[PDB]
Write a protein that binds this ligand. Structure first.
Ligand SMILES: Nc1ncnc2c1ncn2[C@@H]1O[C@H](COP(=O)(O)OP(=O)(O)O)[C@@H](O)[C@H]1O
Ligand SMILES: Nc1ncnc2c1ncn2[C@@H]1O[C@H](COP(=O)(O)OP(=O)(O)O)[C@@H](O)[C@H]1O
Ligand SMILES: [Zn+2]
Ligand SMILES: [Zn+2]
Ligand SMILES: [Zn+2]
Lengths: 410, 188, 379, 179
């Protein structure tokens, strides 16, 4: 992904918004015939979990607990998951040696149950204001409803019947003179250790304190398990109910697991001329493909193009064997030996075929970029078939063109 | 006030003119590019050209919809939230306040003066806004001179030249003897 | 119905959380770390192409709705707090991002000043908003914002950060750790905005009016021989590990004065209240004066509220404001949440009102049909 | 370089046995307790100490040069002892990297010159970036990237890590041959 530079050769997406992304990041949509990007697809929320103590919490409990773990804590000074140490328990960090004793929080007899965050200072005033505005909003709703049904009736406010407990909040008292800056600030050395930085100030927003002794450790933030759903298609992919300590997908779907992935095996000279060898591995068990197209003339956004890649080669039938094969186990005649193609095809191993592209570098100053279209026989299986019961000839016949953009090192 | 309200709309387009010197170039932007639409609602729905204006420093600013909906506040000052009649209203009200016999002749003789009538399509809008308020089948002639900005002075220049002006003005010795009223009583 | 989310996109920091809460859940710098870019690009930027702004806001809102808040965007409503006279194309884009991409039920474009008034409970009050870009004031009288009597000056965070950078480069004394124990000037050509902001918050403070007025005349040096008060001690600040910048005591209490300096025009953060209040209706004068509100993170700076209220009462006695605003009692309101998170708290209090929210707010079905967001400009 | 893995020619001196290749330059003081079941690679000047260990490594494990894998000591009141670490399947430890980690999960790409702290657990399908410090007793979830001197959540990985990482480690092993 990162070790090999997947962020070089990119695949194009069809729709409203055109995007150039690596095949590793993209997803293939099986309901229809069009691969779509992580940007294009809509995101959902499945499950919440703590990154320290991996515990799958339900959606209801998260809303009550404000998307936080009760047991785990993150240090305020540096941003790292704290650890309980005994002597009878105090909270301490590994990276920085900030303790819970420093700020002056008393040690608890019970390990987890004892620790808590103080109640918000303006929580009582809050509820009183909500209830005042709630009652006041309810009057406007009744007024707006009464006005709307009178318009809908269209009786011109005809008086058939006779027309027409209060909550009163006291408004906050305005101070005559606000407290001045203490005379300590004048003629006193300022230790930057004692006062807190903006980053660690703002992590505790309810009462962001200037001094470090006031700054208490906040609960550790819960992380999210994303599930993707498309515009045209319904489902796409999702994750299990035990995503904590699991790398399994409930429905595995990705562009590299359907569309044939292209990789630049060899990179030649960048001095005005060369011959680059690229591989075209298949992922499907049995299929056919072809890199025939030259991306037309000024069509399909070829603005990035800074070279003329010929790739004048007819289709080559490659197949993947999902099994541990030996070094040159058997030599097939019709697949390998019959299309010898010594100039075009470099090598043909198991689920692998090297192809020579004749690029024209140094058309611009530098940063050589090549546009070429790749075709493949997509066994869609859109119609109802149990273990390939249906023939799926019309599906296999369908030729899907992916506009690839390979970027040479330069 | 139109210059002040244009500065607000220019900040709503995303160009600040906070400085008192920068207020002068807002007055220049107004004077250069600001057209009064006959129907304001139709021009708002229509997508603007966004005509570029060049500043003293050399930088360009695309004015867009602020151009036409700034001087509209003359004809409809309730939009920003200023309790006034409006330029179309004060003209009609002034005629309607006068005696019934004169109303027809006063509608038939209207003269535009000052610099805040030189707005492109001011006479076109005013004629339309006056007609609907004024009585039906009445001749409304808004006779603008070519020298509207300098009309007030030219009047004084003619008045001053006349031998009657010799009688009208108050002498320095008259002001010393008569008192303070001397200037007020001779005014008319 | 579900508890509607509140977002407040600012140049420096964005406030995020849920309605009917004591304060915002997440507050973070309004930036995004794009691959290739060493310094992260700012998400809100006025006067750029719509497509480039659309991509930045799409990237940012995604981070807010998944990494910071954990909730589906389509499920529950939005209460977008944005200041009055926010650029047209920016607000149009922000809504278009929420309605098209995220497919939110309904957005409510509340003005920050009217939201700040709700938190106190008082129906009428003057509201000063000392933000990053511009320090804006807008009188709110019994629910109606008075756009006629608006006021704004560029004396916020950005103008203060720039002033600090200028002063530090003049009196530049850094200990690199390479025979740089001796005072070394301008080793780095520019100082990054992240450092300048941290220096401002920790080192610099707002002086008293009496001491400040002397500092103004001192640096001017108006036919006087060393007429400055005794400064605080010099604070040593680390830059990128090894390099230790010695911050001069004069810089700490002089950097702030650019806000409260008259500069001939008579245009300070203090004057802007009195300039606006004098332009207000004659009946509203005494009610607005008595109910002052000071929001924005720039006013959090230690001893700002005392200097402002003092500088007001001094500028009152000045002959310009002496006639109209002479015998007026200026009293400041202390809001429940902190000065930074007053704006957000209003939107949450408003978001808790499910019945009024749905009616006032613009539904997606209306936007998809029309494609016209309602504004204080003509329709 | 552009998806394709590049050639690396090894010298004659290297201990090749049952698929497992271990550079003779690289000392592994404590050969008894350390175990390499699969076709593992250990590059030159690397350390795998047997300080009361049980260092089990993956099928296609890779450890680049100047890199150390030492077990951490558990500060227990009952008895202070070195906790035996278990490197997962298809693990890629980058060059000059320090590892004091207990239980490193399968299909992981640990970055260059990155110090992992004492008693540090890593779950499967994660990636630590280069010049990064994971503090003692920290956990990193699957499909995550931890970075910075603090060592905290930077973002998420590509969905296809489980399938992709297999190609990387196996290709490197296959491409890494004698001269
Ligand atoms: N060509 C113009 N187009 C639009 N507005 C103009 C133009 N010329 C002047 N103005 C406006 O009119 C003002 C001039 O008013 P003026 O006629 O001098 O007033 P007075 O009659 O009191 O002397 C300018 O400040 C400007 O706002
Ligand atoms: N707690 C604080 N203490 C001191 N200064 C602060 C604090 N919070 C923010 N600031 C400063 O004041 C500014 C407040 O800007 P803010 O109101 O968050 O942005 P915006 O005006 O774009 O909504 C910040 O840029 C920062 O420089
Ligand atoms: Zn689809
Ligand atoms: Zn936890
Ligand atoms: Zn810490």
């Amino acid at each position: 992904a990162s070790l090999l530079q997947s962020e070089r050769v990119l695949y194009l997406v069809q729709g409203e918004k055109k995007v150039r992304a690596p095949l590793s990041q993209l997803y293939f949509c099986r309901y229809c015939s069009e691969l779509r990007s992580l940007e294009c697809v809509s995101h959902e929320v499945d499950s919440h979990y703590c990154p320290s103590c991996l515990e799958n919490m339900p959606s209801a409990e998260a809303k009550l607990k404000k998307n936080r773990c009760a047991n785990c804590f993150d240090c305020p000074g540096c941003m790292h998951t704290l650890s309980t140490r005994a002597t009878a328990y105090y909270l301490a960090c590994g990276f920085c040696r900030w303790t819970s004793r420093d700020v002056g929080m008393a040690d608890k007899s019970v390990a987890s149950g004892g620790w808590q965050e103080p109640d918000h200072p303006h929580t009582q005033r809050m509820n009183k204001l909500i209830e005042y505005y709630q009652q006041l909003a309810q009057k406007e709703k009744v007024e707006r409803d009464r006005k709307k049904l009178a318009r809908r009736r269209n009786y011109m406010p005809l008086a058939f019947s006779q027309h027409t407990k209060e909550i009163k909040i006291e408004p906050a008292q305005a101070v005559d003179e606000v407290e001045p800056l203490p005379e300590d600030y004048y003629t006193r050395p300022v230790n930057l250790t004692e006062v807190t930085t903006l980053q660690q100030r703002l992590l505790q927003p309810d009462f962001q304190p200037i001094c470090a002794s006031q700054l208490y450790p906040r609960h550790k933030h819960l992380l999210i398990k994303r599930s993707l759903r498309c515009r045209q298609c319904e489902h796409n992919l999702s994750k299990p109910e035990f995503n904590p300590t699991s790398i399994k997908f409930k429905i595995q779907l990705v562009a590299v697991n359907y569309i044939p992935e292209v990789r630049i095996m060899s990179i030649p000279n960048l001095r005005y001329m060369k011959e680059s060898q690229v591989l075209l591995t298949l992922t499907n068990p049995v299929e056919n493909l072809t890199h025939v197209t030259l991306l037309e003339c000024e069509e399909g956004d070829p603005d990035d193009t800074n070279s003329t890649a010929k790739v004048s080669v007819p289709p080559t039938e490659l197949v993947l064997a999902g099994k541990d094969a030996a070094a040159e186990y058997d030599e097939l005649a019709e697949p390998q030996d019959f299309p010898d193609d010594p100039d075009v095809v470099a090598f043909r191993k198991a689920n692998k075929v090297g192809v020579f592209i004749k690029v024209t570098p140094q058309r611009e100053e530098g940063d050589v970029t090549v546009c070429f279209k790749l075709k493949h026989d997509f066994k869609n299986l859109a119609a109802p078939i149990r273990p390939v019961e249906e023939a799926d000839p019309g599906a296999e016949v369908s030729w899907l063109t992916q506009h690839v953009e390979l970027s040479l090192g330069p | 006030d139109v210059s002040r309200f244009l500065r607000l709309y220019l900040r709503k387009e995303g160009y600040d003119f906070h400085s008192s010197s920068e207020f002068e170039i807002v007055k220049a932007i107004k004077e250069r590019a600001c057209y009064l639409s006959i129907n304001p609602q139709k021009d708002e729905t229509l997508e603007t050209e966004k005509a570029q204006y060049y500043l003293p420093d050399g930088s360009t600013i695309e004015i867009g919809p602020s151009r036409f909906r700034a001087p509209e506040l003359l004809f409809r000052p309730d939009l920003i939230g200023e309790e006034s009649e409006g330029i179309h209203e004060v003209l009609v009200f002034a005629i309607q306040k006068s005696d019934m016999d004169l109303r027809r002749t006063l509608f038939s003789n209207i003269v535009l003066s000052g610099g805040s009538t030189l707005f492109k399509g001011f006479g076109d809008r005013l004629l339309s806004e006056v007609k609907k308020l004024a009585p039906k089948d009445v001749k409304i002639r808004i006779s603008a001179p070519q020298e509207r900005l300098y009309s007030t002075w030219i009047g004084g220049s003619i008045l001053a030249s006349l031998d009657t002006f010799k009688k009208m003005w108050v002498s320095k010795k008259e002001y010393e003897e008569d008192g303070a009223r001397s200037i007020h009583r001779k005014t008319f | 119905e579900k508890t509607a989310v509140v977002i407040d996109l600012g140049e420096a920091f964005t406030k995020c959380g849920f309605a009917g809460e004591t304060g915002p859940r997440c507050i973070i710098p309004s930036v995004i770390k794009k691959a290739g870019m060493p310094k992260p690009i700012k998400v809100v930027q006025y006067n750029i192409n719509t497509e480039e702004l659309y991509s930045y806001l799409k990237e940012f809102i995604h981070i807010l709705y998944f990494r910071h808040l954990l909730v589906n965007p389509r499920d529950r409503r939005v209460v977008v707090i944005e200041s009055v006279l926010c650029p047209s194309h920016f607000r149009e884009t922000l809504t278009r991002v929420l309605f098209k991409y995220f497919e939110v039920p309904s957005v409510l474009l509340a003005p920050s000043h009217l939201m700040a008034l709700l938190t106190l409970g008082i129906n009428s009050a003057m509201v000063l908003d000392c933000g990053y870009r511009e320090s804006l004031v807008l009188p709110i009288y019994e629910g109606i914002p008075v756009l006629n009597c608006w006021g704004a000056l560029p004396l916020g965070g950005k103008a203060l950060h720039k002033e600090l950078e200028t002063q530090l480069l003049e009196q530049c004394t850094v200990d690199t750790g390479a025979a740089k124990e001796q005072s070394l000037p301008s080793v780095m050509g520019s100082i990054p905005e992240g450092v300048l902001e941290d220096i401002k918050v920790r080192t610099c403070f707002v002086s008293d009016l009496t001491r400040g007025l002397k500092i103004q005349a001192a640096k001017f040096n108006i036919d006087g021989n060393t007429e400055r008060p005794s400064p605080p001690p010099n604070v040593d600040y680390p830059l990128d590990g090894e390099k230790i910048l010695h911050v001069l005591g004069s810089i700490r209490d002089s950097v702030v004065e650019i806000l409260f300096e008259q500069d001939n025009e008579e245009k300070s953060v203090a004057t802007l209240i009195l300039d606006s209040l004098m332009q207000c209706p004659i009946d509203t004068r005494k009610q607005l004066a008595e109910n002052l509100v000071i929001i924005g993170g720039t006013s959090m700076l230690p001893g700002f509220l005392h200097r402002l209220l003092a500088e007001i009462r001094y500028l009152v006695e000045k002959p310009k404001y002496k006639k109209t605003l002479g015998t007026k009692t200026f009293r400041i309101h202390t809001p429940p949440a902190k000065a930074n998170c007053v704006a957000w708290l209003g939107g949450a209090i408003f978001g808790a009102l499910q019945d009024i929210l749905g009616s006032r707010s613009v539904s997606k079905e209306y936007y998809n049909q029309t494609g016209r967001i309602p504004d204080w400009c003509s329709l | 370089m552009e998806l394709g893995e590049l050639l690396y020619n090894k010298s004659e001196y290297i201990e090749t046995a049952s698929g497992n290749k271990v550079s003779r330059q690289s000392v592994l003081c404590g050969s008894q307790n350390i175990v390499l079941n699969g076709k593992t690679i250990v590059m030159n000047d690397c350390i795998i100490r047997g300080d009361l260990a049980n260092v089990r490594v993956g099928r296609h494990c890779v450890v680049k040069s100047r890199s150390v894998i030492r077990p951490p000591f558990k500060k227990f009141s009952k008895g202070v002892a070195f906790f035996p670490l278990h490197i997962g399947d298809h693990v890629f430890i980058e060059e000059d990297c320090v590892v004091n980690a207990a239980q490193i999960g399968s299909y992981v790409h640990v970055g260059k010159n990155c110090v992992i702290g004492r008693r540090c657990v890593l779950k499967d399908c994660c990636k630590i970036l280069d010049n990064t410090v994971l503090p003692p007793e920290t956990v990193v979830p699957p499909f995550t990237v931890f970075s910075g001197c603090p060592g905290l959540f930077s973002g998420e990985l590509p969905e296809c890590t489980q399938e992709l990482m297999i190609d990387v480690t196996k290709s490197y092993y296959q491409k890494f041959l004698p001269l």
